[PDB]
């Protein structure tokens, strides 16, 4: 039976929200362990029959971009680290090394001669070089979507299986800025047995260390039974560098970083340098080091101790390999032979550490606590909370979500067929997956890299978008053209993509107008794709060169349509106002597209000489004092003008929205009867401190609560149509738009912070919902976690990642804000929600980036706003740490992240065109998604294989029958199935051979992967 994820509160030893409520977070000086205490141990704890086993694990943290680009670091540092690791591990059989970032390792290995490839394979096979995690990168855990965490994990592990014949089962995450339970969720479903984390709040490290709870079985917050649990090691100290990994006193541990004696340009800030180990000092040196090790061991439950030995881009020079290796070997020889220490120390790997810990556990020497929750928001010291990077470089955060969807759609659309090598499908998909995967790095999507590195990530993602477009349009042409007519040129553009929300109106004028005319071209085919596994209707829009356009399906049935002007906003330097201009040569046509599950639907746009029967025209009202005319070319309705005033709008039988005279929402009425519920949007600004620590790309250090943006008398544009209405207003730094299509409104903000230095712009919602101190935010687009706003912590500590949505509720009412981009946000008072839009910061914030954030560019942020009655919903109890979306909020999120794709046929006539693809595909319940569909074999494989990742969310029961759907069996989506297997989520291991070749659907909050084999 499926676990109930709502009604049983798991019993765990440590529940992070409960721990937060209880903890006092006092920042006291703990002595040499600044954020701890003076650790004491009983020397008689170890003896001949109970020794301390110490694993020193050499490592090198290699950022795939940060202060230099990926390729710059590869040429300057990483290729030398890997070349010298190969040499020194080969020559020194007891030395060990771990490696995390497969993007760099693949970059290196493919440039090796065969002789060196063979030597590399041998030091991996014999266990000297060990891959940890084996993702393409070490990803951010706050802003990343779980689908892209899995994508990058799969990209790295598929490479490693192919070329190194290994699949890591231990994860190493020493640098992401706070940690998410989405990681153990994905890793445990991908064969992992152990993971390690580091950047958790210094007060959490102290609290868990005092209880010896730094090693725990980390389960998901809803998991009563514990089947999601993954053994997790949290490192105890302030950094992963050598001063903070040997033991609690960095002034002592720095003396054991043998790269700091001077010739390498490094030194010890605690003013005592390392000394070369010799026969004359090894006993004293070992005394000092073993005492640090035994203090660190006090914080953990077994007699097996992990000592990382590394730092950023370490193990580069041959002289550095020698100075670390030779000095540690001298220490190990002395320590291991001096019975009075009762220690056995050696170089080891991460897996070796975890294997020895679990051998101790099985021998009955330790029992580990259970834990649920997350580790946000991180602070490394004092009040320095790392909530700034939840928003930094928001243009690229939004681009991540656009590319996420494009990769999914290109892999799915092209998976239906096998393609000849000449089509370059696999090549373009590999490039797209790798550039998106690279951006999941903890200096990519986080917005914490130097300006020229951000430009490199953007250029890579632009090439990845172009790759996706090529694959998608080739696939649409093949899926919708009569097979005996299909005659592809794999370099040709049969369709171009039309995307209404990226980069966005006002960000780039990149959309193509469909040009129709009696003397050039009467009509145009367009095609919509729906990547979701259920039938979808959704309004779509295109630019057209006439307002007199009508739409038909490919059975020539008329489709109701609305035409609206194309409005653009200009900051007018002559009048010093922000106001809209309408085009006099292009127009927007909007209509409802109905598209099969995982399918395609074709429509035709036809010009006529006059208003067509099934096309209506929106009215337009410009509210401002001092108006001037707004001609619209051939558009048949004249614009109307008026002074600023409150206005109300309703589309279809949907909610009625009321707006202030400044163009901002004031209330929502859900039904014709019901109350006008206050829901007010407001824009505010945070500044930066003029004394003490400055906000930068990582840190948010506001100078108090936000202050309202002074709005003046902004110009408001109201467009009212049968199918779509909107209110748009030109505010300082934001063109804010509320769009209504008959259900939950859509909000679009065109955010241009301009030259406003030391400013963070926030969008706040004010309501009467009696939420108190509780609010909910998501983790990686996968789950919603309960937050409690703690007044004992500063403002910036109450900011959390908002990777896809947030909500507040009381007994009767909920307000959910869904996002199309990860941003930071909070609820700083009962009834409020707020989300940061952009931040422009002049100073560096002392974490090594060496710049502020002064490279802002206009970005179009998108949202959905769902106000709902929830008193009839079956919700978790007050003690449950999770929350769950309603059906309407989940569908609104899907509308933002995986919209219909739109294709415009590029030539004048499409011969052989077909009207639909996928009409026979099952329309699966609403809580189930086909997150990934990917063909895993090239055309030369006799047995083709297609992989699917199926995710089922959990939606609240609120009494809507909402029913009859068809079972989805992904293993029968392609014909001639010969086998169906359940696999790990990376597709790399078969877990179950399935009866009747049927892939079962999954339980709420579960994710499974299946591979179908076809003998076609
Ligand atoms: C891959 O490793 C497995 C595990 O022992 C081994 O049996 C197999 O032969 C290896 N494949 C090769 C040799 O590349
Ligand atoms: N350890 C530092 C943090 C910075 O953001 C970059 O990821 C470096 O590795
Ligand atoms: Zn890093």
UniProtKB/Swiss-Prot annotation:
Gene Ontology MF terms: alpha-mannosidase activity; carbohydrate binding; mannosidase activity; mannosyl-oligosaccharide 1,3-1,6-alpha-mannosidase activity; metal ion binding
GO process terms (BP): encapsulation of foreign target; mannose metabolic process; N-glycan processing; protein glycosylation; rhodopsin biosynthetic process
Principal subcellular localization: Golgi
Entry's Gene Ontology cellular component terms: endoplasmic reticulum; Golgi membrane; Golgi stack
Catalytic reaction(s) noted: N(4)-{beta-D-GlcNAc-(1->2)-alpha-D-Man-(1->3)-[alpha-D-Man-(1->3)-[alpha-D-Man-(1->6)]-alpha-D-Man-(1->6)]-beta-D-Man-(1->4)-beta-D-GlcNAc-(1->4)-beta-D-GlcNAc}-L-asparaginyl-[protein] + 2 H2O = 2 alpha-D-mannopyranose + an N(4)-{beta-D-GlcNAc-(1->2)-alpha-D-Man-(1->3)-[alpha-D-Man-(1->6)]-beta-D-Man-(1->4)-beta-D-GlcNAc-(1->4)-beta-D-GlcNAc}-L-asparaginyl-[protein]
Location within or outside the cell: Golgi apparatus membrane
Record's note on what induces expression: Inhibited by swainsonine and by copper sulfate.
Cofactor: Zn(2+)
Protein family according to the UniProt entry: Belongs to the glycosyl hydrolase 38 family.
Function: Catalyzes the first committed step in the biosynthesis of complex N-glycans. It controls conversion of high mannose to complex N-glycans; the final hydrolytic step in the N-glycan maturation pathway.
Protein name per the record: Alpha-mannosidase 2
Taxonomic source organism: Drosophila melanogaster (Fruit fly)
Gene: alpha-Man-IIa
């Amino acid at each position: 039976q499926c676990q109930d994820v709502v009604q049983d509160v798991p019993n765990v030893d440590v529940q992070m929200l409960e721990l937060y409520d209880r903890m006092s977070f006092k920042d006291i000086d703990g002595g040499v362990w600044k954020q701890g205490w003076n650790i004491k141990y009983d020397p008689l704890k170890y003896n001949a029959h109970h020794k301390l086993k110490v694993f020193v694990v050499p490592h090198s943290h290699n950022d795939p971009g940060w202060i230099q680009t990926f390729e710059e670091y590869y040429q300057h540092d990483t290729k030398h680290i890997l070349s010298n690791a190969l040499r020194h591990l080969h020559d020194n059989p007891e030395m060990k090394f771990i490696w995390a970032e497969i993007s760099y390792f693949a970059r290196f290995y493919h440039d090796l001669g065969e002789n060196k490839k063979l030597q590399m394979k041998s030091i991996v096979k014999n266990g000297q070089l060990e891959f940890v995690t084996g993702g393409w990168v070490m990803p951010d855990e706050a802003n990343s979507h779980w689908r892209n965490v899995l994508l990058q994990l799969t990209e790295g592990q598929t490479w490693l299986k192919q070329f190194m014949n290994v699949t890591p089962t231990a994860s190493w995450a020493i640098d992401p800025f706070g940690h998410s339970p989405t990681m153990p969720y994905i890793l445990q479903k991908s064969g992992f047995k152990n993971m390690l984390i580091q950047r958790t709040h210094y007060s959490v490290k102290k609290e868990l260390a005092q209880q010896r709870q730094l090693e725990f079985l980390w389960r998901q917050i809803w998991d009563n039974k514990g089947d999601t649990a993954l053994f997790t090691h949290m490192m105890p100290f302030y950094s992963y560098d050598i001063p903070h990994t040997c033991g609690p006193d960095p002034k002592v541990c720095c003396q054991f970083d043998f790269k700091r004696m001077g010739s390498f340009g490094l030194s010890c800030p605690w003013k005592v340098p390392p000394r070369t180990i010799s026969d004359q000092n090894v006993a004293a040196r070992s005394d000092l080091l073993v005492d640090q090790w035994k203090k660190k061991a006090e914080l953990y439950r077994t007699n097996v101790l992990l000592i990382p030995l590394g730092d950023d881009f370490r193990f580069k020079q041959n002289t550095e390999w020698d100075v670390q290796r030779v000095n540690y070997e001298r220490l190990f020889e002395h320590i291991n032979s001096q019975a009075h220490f009762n220690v056995q120390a050696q170089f080891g790997t991460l897996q070796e550490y975890f294997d020895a810990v679990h051998q101790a556990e099985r021998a009955g020497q330790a029992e580990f606590p259970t834990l649920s929750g997350d580790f946000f928001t991180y602070a490394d010291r004092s009040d320095n909370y790392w909530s700034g990077y939840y928003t930094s470089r928001p243009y690229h955060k939004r681009m991540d979500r656009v590319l996420m969807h494009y990769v999914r759609a290109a892999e799915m659309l092209s998976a239906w067929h096998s393609w000849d090598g000449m089509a370059r499908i696999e090549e373009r998909l590999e490039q797209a997956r790798r550039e998106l995967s690279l951006f999941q790095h903890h200096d990519g999507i986080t917005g914490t890299a130097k300006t020229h590195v951000v430009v490199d990530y953007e250029q890579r993602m632009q090439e990845a978008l172009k790759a996706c477009q090529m694959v998608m349009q080739q696939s649409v042409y093949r899926l919708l053209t009569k097979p005996s007519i299909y005659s592809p040129d794999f370099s040709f553009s049969y369709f171009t993509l039309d995307d209404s929300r990226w980069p966005g109106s006002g960000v780039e004028d990149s959309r193509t107008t469909i040009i129709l005319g009696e003397d050039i071209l009467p009509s145009k085919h367009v095609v919509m794709h729906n990547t979701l596994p259920h039938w979808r209707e959704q309004l779509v829009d295109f630019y057209v060169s006439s307002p007199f356009v009508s739409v038909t399906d490919l059975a020539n049935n008329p489709v109701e349509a609305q035409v609206s002007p194309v409005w653009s906003w200009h900051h007018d330097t002559l009048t010093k106002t922000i106001h809209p201009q309408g085009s006099t040569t292009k127009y927007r046509i909007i209509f409802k597209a109905r598209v099969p599950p995982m399918g395609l639907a074709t429509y035709v746009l036809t010009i006529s000489d006059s208003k067509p029967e099934h096309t209506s025209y929106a009215s337009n009202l410009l509210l401002r004092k001092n108006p001037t005319s707004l001609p619209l070319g051939q558009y048949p309705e004249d614009v109307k003008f008026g002074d600023p005033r409150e206005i109300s709008l309703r589309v279809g039988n949907g909610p009625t929205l009321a707006f202030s005279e400044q163009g901002l929402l004031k209330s929502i009425q859900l039904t014709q009867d019901s109350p006008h519920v206050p829901v007010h949007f407001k824009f505010l600004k945070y500044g930066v401190r003029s004394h003490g620590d400055r906000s930068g790309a990582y840190l948010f250090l506001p100078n108090g609560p936000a202050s309202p943006v002074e709005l003046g008398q902004p110009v408001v544009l109201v467009t009212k149509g049968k199918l779509e209405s909107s209110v748009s207003v030109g505010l300082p730094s934001v063109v804010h738009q509320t769009i209504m299509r008959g259900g939950a409104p859509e909000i679009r903000n065109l955010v241009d912070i301009g030259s406003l230095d030391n400013t963070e712009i926030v969008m706040r919602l004010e309501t009467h919902i009696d939420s108190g101190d509780i609010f909910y935010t998501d983790l990686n687009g996968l789950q919603f976690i309960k937050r409690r706003r703690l007044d004992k912590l500063p403002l910036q500590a109450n900011y959390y990642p908002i990777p896809s949505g947030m909500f507040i509720e009381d007994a009767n009412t909920r307000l959910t804000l869904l996002t199309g981009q990860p941003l930071g946000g909070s609820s700083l008072a009962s009834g409020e929600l707020e989300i940061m839009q952009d931040r422009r910061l002049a100073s560096d914030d002392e974490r090594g980036l060496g710049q502020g954030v002064l490279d802002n560019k206009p970005v179009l942020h998108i949202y959905r706003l769902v106000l709902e009655k929830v008193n009839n919903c079956v919700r978790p109890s007050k003690l449950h740490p999770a929350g769950y979306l309603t059906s309407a909020a989940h569908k609104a999120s899907q509308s933002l992240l995986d919209p219909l794709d739109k294709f415009i046929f590029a030539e004048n006539e499409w011969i052989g065109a077909q009207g639909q693809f996928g009409g026979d595909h099952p329309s699966a319940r609403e809580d189930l998604d086909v997150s990934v569909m990917r063909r895993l074999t090239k055309s030369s494989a006799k047995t083709q294989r297609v992989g699917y990742v199926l995710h089922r969310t959990n939606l609240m029961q609120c009494g809507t029958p909402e029913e009859h759907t068809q079972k989805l069996d992904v293993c029968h989506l392609l014909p001639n199935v010969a086998r169906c297997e359940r696999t790990t989520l990376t597709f790399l291991q078969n877990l179950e051979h399935l009866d009747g070749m049927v892939a079962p659907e999954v339980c709420p909050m579960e994710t499974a992967a299946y591979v179908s084999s076809h003998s076609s």
